[PDB]
Amino acid sequence: TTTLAFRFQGGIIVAVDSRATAGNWVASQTVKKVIEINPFLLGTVAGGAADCQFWETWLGSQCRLHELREKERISVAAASKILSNLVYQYKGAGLSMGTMICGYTRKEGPTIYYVDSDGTRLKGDIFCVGSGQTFAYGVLDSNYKWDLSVEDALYLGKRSILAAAHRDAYSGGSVNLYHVTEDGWIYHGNHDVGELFWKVKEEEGSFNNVIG
Amino acid sequence: TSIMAVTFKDGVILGADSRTTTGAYIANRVTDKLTRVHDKIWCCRSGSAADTQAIADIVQYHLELYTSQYGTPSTETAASVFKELCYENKDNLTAGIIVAGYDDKNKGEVYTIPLGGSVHKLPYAIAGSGSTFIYGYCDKNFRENMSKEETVDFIKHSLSQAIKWDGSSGGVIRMVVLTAAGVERLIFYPDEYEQL
Amino acid sequence: TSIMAVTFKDGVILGADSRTTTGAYIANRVTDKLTRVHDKIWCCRSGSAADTQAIADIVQYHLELYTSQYGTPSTETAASVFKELCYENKDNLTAGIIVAGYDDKNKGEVYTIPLGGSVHKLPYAIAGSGSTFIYGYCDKNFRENMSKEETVDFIKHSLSQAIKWDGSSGGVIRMVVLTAAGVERLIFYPDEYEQL
Amino acid sequence: QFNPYGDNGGTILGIAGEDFAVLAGDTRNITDYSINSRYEPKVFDCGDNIVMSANGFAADGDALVKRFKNSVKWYHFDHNDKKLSINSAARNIQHLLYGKRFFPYYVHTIIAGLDEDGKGAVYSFDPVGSYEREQCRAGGAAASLIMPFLDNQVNFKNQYEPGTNGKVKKPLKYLSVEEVIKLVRDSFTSATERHIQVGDGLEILIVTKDGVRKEFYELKRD
Amino acid sequence: SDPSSINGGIVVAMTGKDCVAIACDLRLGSQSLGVSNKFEKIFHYGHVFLGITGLATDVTTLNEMFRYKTNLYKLKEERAIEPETFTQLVSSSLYERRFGPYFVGPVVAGINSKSGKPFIAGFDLIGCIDEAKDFIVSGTASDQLFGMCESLYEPNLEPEDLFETISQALLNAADRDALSGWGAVVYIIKKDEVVKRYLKMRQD
Amino acid sequence: MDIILGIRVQDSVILASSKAVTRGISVLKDSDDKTRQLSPHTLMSFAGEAGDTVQFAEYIQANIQLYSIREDYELSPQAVSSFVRQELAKSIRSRRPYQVNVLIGGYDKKKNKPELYQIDYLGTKVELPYGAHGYSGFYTFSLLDHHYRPDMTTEEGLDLLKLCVQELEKRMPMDFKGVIVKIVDKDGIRQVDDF
Amino acid sequence: MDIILGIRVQDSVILASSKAVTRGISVLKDSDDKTRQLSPHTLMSFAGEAGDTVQFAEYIQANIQLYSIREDYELSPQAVSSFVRQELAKSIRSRRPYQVNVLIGGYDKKKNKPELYQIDYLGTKVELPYGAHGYSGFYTFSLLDHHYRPDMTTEEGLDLLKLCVQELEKRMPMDFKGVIVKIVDKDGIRQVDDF
Amino acid sequence: TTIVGVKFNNGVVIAADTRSTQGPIVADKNCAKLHRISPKIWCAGAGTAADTEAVTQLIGSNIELHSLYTSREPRVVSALQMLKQHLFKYQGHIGAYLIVAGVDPTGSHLFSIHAHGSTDVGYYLSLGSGSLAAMAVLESHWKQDLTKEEAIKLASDAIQAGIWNDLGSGSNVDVCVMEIGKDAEYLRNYLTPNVREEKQKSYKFPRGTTAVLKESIVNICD
Amino acid sequence: TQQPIVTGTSVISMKYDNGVIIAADNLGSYGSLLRFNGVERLIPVGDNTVVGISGDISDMQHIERLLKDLVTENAYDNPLADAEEALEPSYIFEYLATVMYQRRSKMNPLWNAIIVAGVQSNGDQFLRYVNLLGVTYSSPTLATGFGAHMANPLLRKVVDRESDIPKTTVQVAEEAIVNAMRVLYYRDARSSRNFSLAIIDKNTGLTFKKNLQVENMKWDFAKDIKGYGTQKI
Numbered sequence A: 001t002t003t004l005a006f007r008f009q010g011g012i013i014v015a016v017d018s019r020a021t022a023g024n025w026v027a028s029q030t031v032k033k034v035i036e037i038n039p040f041l042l043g044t045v046a047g048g049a050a051d052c053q054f055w056e057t058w059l060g061s062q063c064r065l066h067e068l069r070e071k072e073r074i075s076v077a078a079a080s081k082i083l084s085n086l087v088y089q090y091k092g093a094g095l096s097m098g099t100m101i102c103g104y105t106r107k108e109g110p111t112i113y114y115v116d117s118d119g120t121r122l123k124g125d126i127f128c129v130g131s132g133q134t135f136a137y138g139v140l141d142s143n144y145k146w147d148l149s150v151e152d153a154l155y156l157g158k159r160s161i162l163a164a165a166h167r168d169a170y171s172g173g174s175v176n177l178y179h180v181t182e183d184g185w186i187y188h189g190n191h192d193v194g195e196l197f198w199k200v201k202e203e204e205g206s207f208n209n210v211i212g
Numbered sequence B, C: 001t002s003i004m005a006v007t008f009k010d011g012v013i014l015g016a017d018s019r020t021t022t023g024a025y026i027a028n029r030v031t032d033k034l035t036r037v038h039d040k041i042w043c044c045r046s047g048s049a050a051d052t053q054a055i056a057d058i059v060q061y062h063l064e065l066y067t068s069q070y071g072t073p074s075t076e077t078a079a080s081v082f083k084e085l086c087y088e089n090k091d092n093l094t095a096g097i098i099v100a101g102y103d104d105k106n107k108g109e110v111y112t113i114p115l116g117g118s119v120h121k122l123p124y125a126i127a128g129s130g131s132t133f134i135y136g137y138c139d140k141n142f143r144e145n146m147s148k149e150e151t152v153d154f155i156k157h158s159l160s161q162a163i164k165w166d167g168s169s170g171g172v173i174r175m176v177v178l179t180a181a182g183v184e185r186l187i188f189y190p191d192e193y194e195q196l
Numbered sequence D: 001q002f003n004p005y006g007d008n009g010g011t012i013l014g015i016a017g018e019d020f021a022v023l024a025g026d027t028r029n030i031t032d033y034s035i036n037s038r039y040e041p042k043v044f045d046c047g048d049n050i051v052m053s054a055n056g057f058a059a060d061g062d063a064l065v066k067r068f069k070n071s072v073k074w075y076h077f078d079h080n081d082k083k084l085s086i087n088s089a090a091r092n093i094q095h096l097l098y099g100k101r102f103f104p105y106y107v108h109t110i111i112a113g114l115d116e117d118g119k120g121a122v123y124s125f126d127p128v129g130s131y132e133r134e135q136c137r138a139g140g141a142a143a144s145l146i147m148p149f150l151d152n153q154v155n156f157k158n159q160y161e162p163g164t165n166g167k168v169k170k171p172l173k174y175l176s177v178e179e180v181i182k183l184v185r186d187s188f189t190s191a192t193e194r195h196i197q198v199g200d201g202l203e204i205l206i207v208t209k210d211g212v213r214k215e216f217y218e219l220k221r222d
Numbered sequence E: 001s002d003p004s005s006i007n008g009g010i011v012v013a014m015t016g017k018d019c020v021a022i023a024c025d026l027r028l029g030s031q032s033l034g035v036s037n038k039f040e041k042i043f044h045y046g047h048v049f050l051g052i053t054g055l056a057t058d059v060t061t062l063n064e065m066f067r068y069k070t071n072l073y074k075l076k077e078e079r080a081i082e083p084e085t086f087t088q089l090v091s092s093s094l095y096e097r098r099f100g101p102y103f104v105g106p107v108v109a110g111i112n113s114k115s116g117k118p119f120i121a122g123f124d125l126i127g128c129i130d131e132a133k134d135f136i137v138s139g140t141a142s143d144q145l146f147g148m149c150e151s152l153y154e155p156n157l158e159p160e161d162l163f164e165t166i167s168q169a170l171l172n173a174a175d176r177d178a179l180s181g182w183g184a185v186v187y188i189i190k191k192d193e194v195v196k197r198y199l200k201m202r203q204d
Numbered sequence F, G: 001m002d003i004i005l006g007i008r009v010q011d012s013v014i015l016a017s018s019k020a021v022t023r024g025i026s027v028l029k030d031s032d033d034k035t036r037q038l039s040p041h042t043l044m045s046f047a048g049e050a051g052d053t054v055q056f057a058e059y060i061q062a063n064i065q066l067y068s069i070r071e072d073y074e075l076s077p078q079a080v081s082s083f084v085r086q087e088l089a090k091s092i093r094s095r096r097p098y099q100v101n102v103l104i105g106g107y108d109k110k111k112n113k114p115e116l117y118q119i120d121y122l123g124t125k126v127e128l129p130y131g132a133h134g135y136s137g138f139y140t141f142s143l144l145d146h147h148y149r150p151d152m153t154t155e156e157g158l159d160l161l162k163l164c165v166q167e168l169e170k171r172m173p174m175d176f177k178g179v180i181v182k183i184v185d186k187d188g189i190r191q192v193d194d195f
Numbered sequence H: 001t002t003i004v005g006v007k008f009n010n011g012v013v014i015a016a017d018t019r020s021t022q023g024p025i026v027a028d029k030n031c032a033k034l035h036r037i038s039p040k041i042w043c044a045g046a047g048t049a050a051d052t053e054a055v056t057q058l059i060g061s062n063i064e065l066h067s068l069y070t071s072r073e074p075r076v077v078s079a080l081q082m083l084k085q086h087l088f089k090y091q092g093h094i095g096a097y098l099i100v101a102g103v104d105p106t107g108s109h110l111f112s113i114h115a116h117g118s119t120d121v122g123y124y125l126s127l128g129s130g131s132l133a134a135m136a137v138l139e140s141h142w143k144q145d146l147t148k149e150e151a152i153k154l155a156s157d158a159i160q161a162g163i164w165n166d167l168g169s170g171s172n173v174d175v176c177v178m179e180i181g182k183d184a185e186y187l188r189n190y191l192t193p194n195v196r197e198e199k200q201k202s203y204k205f206p207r208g209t210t211a212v213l214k215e216s217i218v219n220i221c222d
Numbered sequence I: 001t002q003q004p005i006v007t008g009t010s011v012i013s014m015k016y017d018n019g020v021i022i023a024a025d026n027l028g029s030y031g032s033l034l035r036f037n038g039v040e041r042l043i044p045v046g047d048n049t050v051v052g053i054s055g056d057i058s059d060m061q062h063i064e065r066l067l068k069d070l071v072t073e074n075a076y077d078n079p080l081a082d083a084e085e086a087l088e089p090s091y092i093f094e095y096l097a098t099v100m101y102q103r104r105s106k107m108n109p110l111w112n113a114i115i116v117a118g119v120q121s122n123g124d125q126f127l128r129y130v131n132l133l134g135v136t137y138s139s140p141t142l143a144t145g146f147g148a149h150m151a152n153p154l155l156r157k158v159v160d161r162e163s164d165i166p167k168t169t170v171q172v173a174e175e176a177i178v179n180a181m182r183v184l185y186y187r188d189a190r191s192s193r194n195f196s197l198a199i200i201d202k203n204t205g206l207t208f209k210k211n212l213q214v215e216n217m218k219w220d221f222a223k224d225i226k227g228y229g230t231q232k233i
């Protein structure tokens, strides 16, 4: 995996790859690494596939029970802490999870929370998680500004995954884009790296290391 | 240890050496490895002293409680209680036990219980470290329905060889005779058996 | 392996089973473990087949070269060459060899060479995995200055028991008779020896 | 030390069509270099038009299928004989597998059937419950041999339209049951040639709205 | 620390009607990190072609070594080495390093100039020759290549058809392996002409 | 030893190399030059095991300088890199291998072209437009994939290099105390003093 | 988690705590506050195993806050530290111990005295004029042995603290992204925003 | 592997399967395990494939030089002695398990050599992963005074047992008959009971399916 | 976590036209020591099933007791205990298979390989295997231990697939089994000459044969074999 999400002027961008690995075996190229918890909450997942899949789906159930009981949508902080407290109970047992709970609420505004399987929980503006996080960071950090447009921010998130998909052997397949606003999350399509790479190379004039 | 039990015409005889070792040091050279679990049901103990001892004590307790309720137990029943302990606690036990007893109906009987916890009813049985050296001898020389004197000679000559070759075995040769007559204890010293 | 060599009135007899094992599989059930290093100096091989084989070949080479220069070697000389190889390469060898030969002066002689590389001259010798089960039997039954027929019976009965108890031993019982008369090969099949 | 796992070999294969789905699997069962059975089926009809196979360690595989079959039974009792949809079955299986997250079922599971729109569906699982719906999946020992062939022939990967300068991709289309069974049979004969744990026989379970049909084919027995 | 799967890569060779094809990917990485997308694994000495997968330092070392040996061969024999002879030379050289081997999976391909017969061969790292009528595979996605070749291949393919088959075998195998891909090269070899094509493949 | 980068542009090769020499919980030096001039138009940066790095670098330097005197002629960057690779290729199967990774930046005077070679301690040589050893690559490669163009000037290359160093200073765990930058071109080797 | 310092002066306790949160070869965050307010006049900084640190800190915080509500009274820094020590002393002989080291800086309103306690994950409590956990101590203790005076002002204490941070930034291998400084005195807890 | 050797009236016959494996993958479906040491001394090899090839060639080379030196046809015991002394020197690290057989002026012979350098003599022998399957057949059907045609049948039947029942053995049966007074006849692929069935479909692609980036003519001439 | 102590070797079996045959030698080995020679490893359950067990003998004796107890439990409140509601081979197998897998799942296995041979109430042949891991499989021929490597190849020459079962008579099937037992005696170092054989036929019922011996053995060729290579005497 490679997953990122960053805060900016126009809300939150969230981008993930779609590759699953079993060692050097490519298990899948079409996997979903963004879980839609509710119309205002997203959860990215990296690490052990089942651990991620099982506990994030479980998190969505706990968030549903919260709004039934409290007649109010759960905060991004509270949602992330339900998950971080859960994985902390399993600390040492060998769970592998690198998640990012992204969403908007009235009291918080746009918020991102990094949560991982050894109990770390961090609020922040920019995070990259997964085997190819460093590759994504390289492109994202060097082009990031708060004043990015929704159009430019979406592209930077897409381009940062593409960069990692290229270099990281354990990332690729396709890019899944999301945009979180005050009105909720908006899906911005699946982008296959098979076509996206050559499209980006030609139009952007980048990737000169590759035989064109 | 070298130990053995042998059925014969009038009943059964148990036999054992008297050497207990902690490494190459002989902790006790006059050990009594023949132990009573009931009036006419005895056993030979090989392997861990502590384990065989703890087992024999529990068996003796069970058979005493059996006798209080249901009268005298069979030799098979005694062996079954031994087995139950040895089998169910096989992971924590190093005990090789030969059970021998005299009923009036069933006459002499010998059951051997190796490390695993399996039961094997036999005409005669040999066990312990020193038994390896006398499989050849005991097989060639054993006969069914021997006399008391023949069986005593068979055990004496066998354990004599087992002792001669096995460093872990030695001292005196204790024996216990189980018949309708009663219970008889025998002993044989090095000066006698060594020069057989 | 079960192997043995026994001196007697007219000379010496070597005896062996025929089972070669790779684990619990019998690779060869008709092995010839009795090997000639000289006209009337033979040896029984136990332990690693490859090692005992390589050694026996070197000894055969040395004794052939000895004969070319100094005439017929003694049985002691043969055992000394075996020892020299086994002792000096003890770290890399798993070989238990019994050397047996017939001189006209010294008559029958038996030398046993265990793992260490030590030499031991004996009236008779037993070795290999299956020998453990017949120490008792062989000690009780061996006599000095036996006849040829008595010694053949002694080896046959002994190896029969060794085979019966040892899983690593079996097949046929090969024997080699070394006397002034010459060299005689004998064989004995399961149908005969099993029911002794 | 006692090792609770073993490898019973073999290989399985699931392909989804427009109004059907197939789940195929060789009938060979092995341990180490020995053949245990030349015909031991591991593709099962579990009711409600769901076929299932859990290839890898047969003991764990049989245990899982047995539990899922039982899960279907109690779904009927507890919910007024309602039909278990393929998507619901998949989620239920995830919980079965993940239930033993820290002492897993050593099996690559595949189920096949029809979705609630009547279209062909193949779901595939890892040993600890991770799952994903696909048009195509090979599982088991020879999965690495078969899977790329399926990518090429079922999903038309790396295939471009002739004369379009590698610009237009070959268009995706559903395959007929006749064309799918051809790919299955060629996949298994190819896998039999190069993998020692695959052979003896091939058993295919086809799932349409009408029910579950079976087909058997011989494979090389070496 | 498994020499055969640090750098990654694949080679595949096929026979056709009066022709042979040999192909390879272009990736060189250090485990997860992709480093170079220009690293070719196929070399040639006269008309004999050699593909080499495995540890990249040895791929380079062996190429330089076989160039060395084939050059001296040509000077003394006064003729170019043939594929059958070269195959033997490779096996000898690899087995010479029996207890300290080059961690490679070489593949010889070429047409015998005298008889005109298409020839391919593979080796394990220790020199064992694997001769084949149909095809030879090598590298981190060898399982994948075996599965692709065994299904896609058919005998007596024409050069233009053979190109399509070998290319599709390599591409679809490479996409299921993390350490292979990043570009590909295919050599189509006829009796007295050789065409080299760079394939367009997904760059992840 | 940790961070060594290389960027080949239109008319030159630029090598950046970290200044920190750490041992244990102490930065012993923050002005270390992790490079040697092999010849007037060839520069080699290095990183790896302590002691091995300099010992290897100076050993190569001595050999190349010996060649230059003997033939009264400068060896090409390609030739030097091939020599270096072979030395490392021998090394790896020695009793104690050199654990040294290197970048060889050189200007070929016959071709009038800059050349950058990346060679690891195994003897794995590759010619690249941009290179890096160690953990640096995990950030810089993707960054350069995006921002690098083949026809850039030396000044553009330095700005591109600043962008790498900034990213490393932001995301790398260890303090590497900045970098020493050196440029290799037709006029030889020179050091950028203010970086 | 890595660098946490503490300096008790005449009328206050000053806690410095590094901002870097690193995992693997990536600095995930450079603005992390490694402290919790246990009560209005008691502050606890913490460092150690990931997850354990915050989980422990918040657990203590909850307990102290519960006490404050129940008794309508603030617990003394000595009492809080004794409670914390006992929790760690239990922890160390648990199935999975908290691997957390803490500094407890507090102002005792009854004594009108600042107090600094250093407690490691074993439950080893000590009252000190200045304290540190991890590798920081190996530099700061000797530095403070020299420059520290017991009658210093808060402003003098901050300059003394700057001298520590400078030394750590110079000699520590890892980039800890500066520190967040907090002062505990008679008027409560406040943060120095410009450091 | 599965390899066997059987003695008969006027000579000896050896046989072998033709499967080569790397892990569970069949590397070669038709490799030659029967090796010529001299014209009338042949060798069947099991174990590490390169070691059986290399050791047999080396000894074969030295046997040829020895035959020229002595002006005599080489003997089986010479090959046996040279092989076992070589294998023993390397303490089993050369993983060659051989069945050596042939005819020479002394007569007909049949031996087996293990990797560690131990040799056996026999009328019937079998080595390799399928030696137990083969030996089962040999033990059931072997008798004294076999004819040539009976020995070839018994030998090939023993190899078949390995082919079918052992996963480490497969494909075809190679045989070599060495009779006294006659030339040794090497019967390559004596039986071929594992022919691949016709594929269901031709996967010949439409020309232009693969996308290309560059073309160039390669110069092979001077 | 166990280690087997006193062990039983190969159990071999096959189907024929009207029923099944199963056989197993009477040896209880103690490592390389051939300790016990009177061990019965075929245990009949009712008059229509025989369970053949290899591996640890203490665990075998435990399984004996479980089967013995299963017959008793089935008879309780069951007027048709010797008729329609009698114990089937398939019932007996599934019970054991459940136990074996439960024990391996608790990391405390019954260290055995088991073959349940029998004939169902409707005349169908039942033959199925289960081991310490809870692995189950069925085939026309089944064997444990060395039997799997040596017996199965021989028995599969008789019945190679399902369609060969009606073509195989009890005379042919029994001859193959007895031959296989001889081959195992030649080649298995932990086997004995004495063995037991059981035939469960749908017509003639259960025939249990005790104290059989391996006979017609070829040993005569041994006398000609001299040395290990270059020896003539």
Ligand SMILES: *[C@@](C)(CO)[C@](*)(O)[C@H](Cc1ccccc1)NC(=O)[C@H](Cc1ccc(OC)cc1)NC(=O)[C@H](C)NC(=O)CN1CCOCC1
Pocket (backbone or CB within 6 Å): A001, A002, A019, A020, A021, A022, A023, A027, A031, A032, A033, A045, A046, A047, A048, A049, A050, A052, A053, A094, A095, A096, A130, A131, A170, A171, D104, D126, D127, D128, D130
């Ligand atoms: C990239 C590809 C790194 O591999 C991502 O982290 C990716 C994330 C992801 C998220 C949701 C769904 C699919 C994939 N992770 C994987 O693909 C993951 C990598 C991984 C494997 C094993 C691990 O050990 C704890 C940690 C990470 N791959 C898997 O989970 C694969 C499909 N499953 C297995 O390997 C099955 N194992 C998992 C561990 O338990 C034993 C069985």
Ligand SMILES: *[C@@](C)(CO)[C@](*)(O)[C@H](Cc1ccccc1)NC(=O)[C@H](Cc1ccc(OC)cc1)NC(=O)[C@H](C)NC(=O)CN1CCOCC1
Pocket (backbone or CB within 6 Å): B001, B002, B019, B020, B021, B022, B023, B027, B031, B032, B033, B045, B046, B047, B048, B049, B050, B052, B094, B128, B129, B168, B169
């Ligand atoms: C002979 C010596 C060897 O088999 C007998 O079995 C003999 C039997 C015996 C002894 C006394 C009373 C009744 C029966 N056994 C011993 O003498 C025994 C040797 C033995 C010790 C430990 C074993 O494994 C657990 C197996 C055999 N000796 C002892 O038990 C002595 C008293 N104690 C020790 O050696 C200390 N042991 C305790 C157990 O753990 C290892 C260290």
Ligand SMILES: *[C@@](C)(CO)[C@](*)(O)[C@H](Cc1ccccc1)NC(=O)[C@H](Cc1ccc(OC)cc1)NC(=O)[C@H](C)NC(=O)CN1CCOCC1
Pocket (backbone or CB within 6 Å): C001, C002, C019, C020, C021, C022, C023, C027, C031, C032, C033, C045, C046, C047, C048, C049, C050, C052, C094, C128, C129, C168, C169, H114, H116, H118
């Ligand atoms: C009985 C079987 C056991 O002591 C005999 O000693 C017998 C002696 C013999 C056999 C054939 C010809 C002459 C003499 N030995 C064997 O059958 C022997 C058993 C054995 C193997 C290895 C040993 O340690 C090195 C000790 C005993 N069998 C073999 O040598 C067989 C042919 N080979 C193997 O088992 C493979 N070994 C090679 C050596 O390293 C371990 C694996």
Ligand SMILES: *[C@@](C)(CO)[C@](*)(O)[C@H](Cc1ccccc1)NC(=O)[C@H](Cc1ccc(OC)cc1)NC(=O)[C@H](C)NC(=O)CN1CCOCC1
Pocket (backbone or CB within 6 Å): E124, E125, E126, E128, H001, H002, H019, H020, H021, H022, H023, H027, H031, H032, H033, H045, H046, H047, H048, H049, H050, H052, H053, H095, H128, H129, H168, H169
């Ligand atoms: C059967 C097939 C065993 O499976 C035979 O013994 C066969 C013998 C053979 C094959 C071809 C030509 C002559 C003889 N053996 C193999 O094919 C052999 C199997 C094997 C692999 C590894 C082993 O561990 C050392 C032992 C046996 N396969 C090979 O030798 C293949 C070609 N090479 C490798 O697997 C790689 N070498 C690397 C160096 O270490 C040995 C394995």
Ligand SMILES: [Mg+2]
Pocket (backbone or CB within 6 Å): A164, A165, A166, A167, A168, A169, A170, A171, A172, E203, E204
């Ligand atoms: Mg990638």
Ligand SMILES: [Mg+2]
Pocket (backbone or CB within 6 Å): B163, B164, B165, B166, B167, B168, B169, B170
């Ligand atoms: Mg004594």
Ligand SMILES: [Mg+2]
Pocket (backbone or CB within 6 Å): D221, D222, H162, H163, H164, H165, H166, H167, H168, H169, H170
């Ligand atoms: Mg086979």
